[PDB]
């Protein structure tokens, strides 16, 4: 398979069966052959083992470099550099020097211009690296992985150079302070890992369907290592990523995510337990009457989707249809510039996004007296201004040519939404604790409602309304914070969020990021509704001549990778002709093409290409061949 191509699942399966039969036949020689077959079987799993090892080590390296680099916008702790501010400023401020102490030694003007200028420099370095070294890293990368799992070939998409470039550029961009996130892209990276650590073995480097299996397995590795959420990751792989996913892969897939967690469980020498900035475990049981917010909040979640999947996508089109796209770097600079100009005055916006999630999730404690535990109206007004600014920004942030993610800012918006309700209920109860909702159940002297859990549920609701995740996102918040008695809230919150967000359309940000780019994706959550015969689905059309069942001109006129006679392929013809010329076509002609009755309705043939994924087929009536039907033709009919 060459670049920008689609796999023929049947050929992959047939090659796999040939390889299995050959190895089993060779097994009848000596015990070494059966032992080698066992080693191959166990190497199939060592693939995921190495995948997770890399997932954990690289998530740690990404967090290390991000902490080392982002805090450079405020200072650097001379003693140590690969730790964070707190680590090198607490383990004992002469070892610490904010750049004002560096240049003047004493003030607000200097810090303002400092944060601005170095923030612009970090953004400039990030964009320069991405442009000159790798374009693919642009975007969270999840929808590209979806198209890849849909049977789409991109040779260099999983290269070592591209992987390292994405790893470095994501760190740089996150350090930039822009409203961009890292949580998802580790799926991309995980997928890349699944290939790189599979290249060492012929089984996964000479059978692309097995690469697909490993990619479906590893897709969970990022969602596990980014958060520390293994099962959430594996069910995210099952639902949202893998276009085809036999159950036998689920358990395999999970190990990937789990091993990443395992790695991120083992990597902790300095006695730091946090899996991420905002890793707030939850073990507080719930009760019946808490369900009212769990639905109500969803509205904003859904409403937020209406705000985002429109605004963002709209601007993206204007990003691709105007002169602006001719100078992306400058745009990012200007973007970064405004980000620095307006985000400094408000401390709430000036601080990071993931750590903002940490603050939102951190339940108040008797020792902590932070802003959210400060018991003030002006602070809430400033928080509202920060929320609107973050909205307008992260809308204008996802579709930029720098490694970008919206897991974190979307969760932040949802967490603000959820904590609004907690603040309102707490302030109302302070004066009317005897009011009915608090009179019946709550006991005196004990915490009864936790705003942080509601903020997490609100983040989940916004992510459901932006990406439309139902069966996994429940597990993602199941595992970002230990659950199995808190599965009920997530199902209800996801239901309400999805319902409210469905009021406008049927496309998420991932589906929208597949639409605007328009990768050849056959949507799986939809079903054809137009009633029609199959006379329309096949081609050529009435405006085109009869099908052209010498070869070079035919390939020039039309771009169909295969033609009928059996059937042959362009790559097969090329290699056969080259070999014959170097040495001087029945053996390559495939005598078993698939066929469907011309009278067959769309609702069966479409799904046959959907889950089985054959590239093309022939259409016959009473045994008379009529034409060829391909994925591209059916997609054009969809469009």
Q: What part of residues 521-560 is at the interface with its own copies (CB under 8 A)?
A: 531
User: Residue-wise over 597-626: b if at least 16 C-beta within 10 A, else e?
Assistant: ebeeebeebbeebbeebbbbbbbeeeeeee
Q: Are 156 and 129 in contact (CB under 8 A)?
A: no
> How many residues bind its own copies, per CB under 8 A?
43
By C-beta, is 331 or 607 nearer to its own copies?
607
Q: Are 510 and 312 in contact (CB under 8 A)?
A: no
560 is in an annotated binding site: yes
By C-beta, is 101 or 607 nearer to its own copies?
607
532 is in an annotated binding site: no
Selected range binding its own copies among 186-194, 535-543, 581-589, 597-605, rule: CB under 8 A: 597-605
Selected range binding its own copies among 210-218, 251-259, 377-385, 507-515, rule: CB under 8 A: 251-259
Q: What part of residues 460-479 is at the interface with its own copies (CB under 8 A)?
A: 470-471, 474, 479
Chain mean position to CA 486: 24
User: Residue-wise over 495-533: b if at least 16 C-beta within 10 A, else e?
Assistant: bbbbbbbeeeeebbbbbbbbbbeebebbeeeeeeeeeee
If residue 562 lies in a helix (H) or strand (E), which one and from where to where? Answer: strand 562-564
Distance CA 297, CA 310 (A): 20
Question: Minimum distance from CB of 136 to its own copies (Å)?
Answer: 28
Sole binder of its own copies in the list 245, 294, 398, 563 (CB under 8 A) = 245
Selected range binding its own copies among 182-190, 192-200, 569-577, 601-609, rule: CB under 8 A: 601-609
Q: Are 406 and 394 in contact (CB under 8 A)?
A: yes
Question: Minimum distance from CB of 247 to its own copies (Å)?
Answer: 6
Structure tokens at 511: 């589906």
Sign of CA pseudo-dihedral 336, 277, 472, 184: positive
Contacts of 284 (CB under 8 A, 6+ apart): 447, 450, 453
Question: Minimum distance from CB of 20 to its own copies (Å)?
Answer: 9
Distance CA 148, CA 521 (A): 9
Binding to its own copies by residue 21, rule CB under 8 A? yes
Sole binder of its own copies in the list 13, 320, 541, 636 (CB under 8 A) = 13
Sole binder of its own copies in the list 331, 600, 610, 637 (CB under 8 A) = 600
Selected range binding its own copies among 111-119, 250-258, 271-279, 361-369, rule: CB under 8 A: 250-258
140 is in an annotated binding site: yes
Question: Minimum distance from CB of 235 to its own copies (Å)?
Answer: 8
Question: For 116-197, where are the E strands, in sequence order?
Answer: none
Question: Minimum distance from CB of 1 to its own copies (Å)?
Answer: 21
40 is in an annotated binding site: no
Contacts of 245 (CB under 8 A, 6+ apart): 216, 237, 238, 253
Known binding residues for chloride are 140, 407, 510
Q: Which residues bind its own copies (CB under 8 A)?
A: 10, 13-14, 17, 21, 231, 238-239, 245, 247-248, 250-251, 255, 258, 470-471, 474, 479, 482-484, 487-488, 491, 531, 591-597, 599-601, 603-604, 620, 622-625
């Amino acid at each position: 398979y060459d670049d920008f191509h689609t796999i023929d699942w049947v050929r992959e399966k047939c090659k796999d069966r040939e390889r299995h039969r050959r190895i089993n036949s060779k097994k009848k020689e000596s015990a070494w052959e059966m032992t080698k077959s066992l080693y191959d079987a166990w190497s199939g799993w060592l693939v995921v083992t190495l995948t997770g090892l890399a997932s954990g080590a690289l998530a740690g390296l990404i967090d290390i470099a991000a902490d080392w680099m982002t805090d450079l916008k405020e200072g650097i702790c001379l003693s140590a550099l690969w730790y964070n501010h707190e680590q090198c400023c607490w383990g004992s401020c002469p070892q610490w020097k904010t750049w004002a102490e560096l240049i003047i030694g004493q003030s607000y003007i200097m810090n303002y211009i400092m944060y601005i200028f170095w923030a612009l420099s970090f953004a400039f370095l990030a964009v320069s690296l991405v442009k000159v070294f790798a374009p693919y890293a642009c975007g969270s990368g999840i929808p590209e992985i979806k198209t890849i799992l849909s049977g789409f070939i991109i040779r260099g998409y999983l290269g070592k150079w591209t992987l390292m470039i994405k790893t470095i550029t994501l760190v740089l961009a996150v350090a930039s302070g822009l409203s961009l996130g890292k949580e998802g892209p580790l799926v991309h990276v995980a997928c890349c890992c699944g290939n790189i650590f599979s290249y060492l073995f012929p089984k996964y480097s000479t059978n692309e369907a097995k690469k697909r299996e490993v990619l479906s397995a590893a897709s969970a590795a990022g969602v596990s290592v980014a958060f520390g959420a293994p099962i959430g990751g594996v069910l995210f792989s099952l639902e949202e990523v893998s276009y085809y996913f036999p159950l036998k892969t689920l358990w395999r897939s999970f190990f990937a995510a789990l091993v990443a967690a395992f790695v991120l469980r083992s990597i902790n020498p300095f006695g730091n337990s946090r899996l991420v900035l905002f890793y707030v475990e939850y073990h507080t049981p719930w009760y019946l009457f808490e369900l009212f917010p769990f639905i109500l909040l969803g509205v904003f979640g859904g409403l937020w989707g209406a705000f985002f999947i429109r605004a963002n996508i709209a601007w993206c089109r204007r990003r691709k249809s105007t002169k602006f796209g001719k100078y992306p770097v400058l745009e990012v600079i200007i973007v970064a510039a405004i980000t620095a100009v307006i985000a400094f005055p408000n401390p709430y916006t000036r601080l990071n996004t993931s750590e903002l999630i940490k603050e939102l999730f951190t339940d108040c404690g008797p020792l902590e007296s932070s802003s959210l535990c400060d018991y003030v109206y002006s602070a809430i007004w400033q928080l509202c201004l920060a929320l609107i600014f973050k909205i307008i920004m992260t809308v204008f942030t996802f579709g930029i040519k720098v490694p970008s993610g919206l897991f974190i800012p979307s969760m932040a918006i949802g967490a603000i939404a959820g904590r609004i309700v907690g603040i309102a209920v707490e302030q109302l109860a302070y004066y009317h604790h005897d009011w009915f909702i608090f009179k019946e159940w709550c006991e005196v002297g004990a915490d009864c409602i936790t705003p942080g859990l509601y903020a997490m549920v609100g983040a989940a609701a916004c992510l459901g309304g932006v990406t439309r995740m139902t069966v996994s996102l429940v597990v993602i918040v199941f595992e970002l914070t230990g659950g199995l008695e808190y599965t009920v809230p997530l199902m209800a919150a996801v239901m309400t969020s999805k319902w409210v967000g469905d009021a406008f359309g049927r496309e998420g940000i991932y589906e929208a990021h597949i639409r605007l780019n328009g990768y050849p994706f056959l949507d799986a959550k939809e079903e054809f509704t137009h009633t029609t015969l199959a006379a329309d689905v096949m081609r050529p059309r009435r405006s085109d001549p009869p099908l052209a069942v010498d070869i070079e001109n035919m390939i020039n006129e039309t771009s169909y990778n295969g033609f009928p006679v059996g059937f042959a392929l362009r790559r097969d013809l090329t290699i056969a002709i080259e070999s014959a010329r170097k040495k001087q076509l029945r053996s390559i002609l495939d005598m078993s093409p698939f066929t469907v009755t011309d009278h067959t309705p769309m609702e069966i043939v479409v799904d046959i290409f959907r889950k089985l994924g054959l590239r093309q087929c022939l259409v016959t009536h009473n045994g008379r061949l009529l034409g060829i039907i391909t994925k591209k033709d059916i997609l054009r009919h969809m469009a």
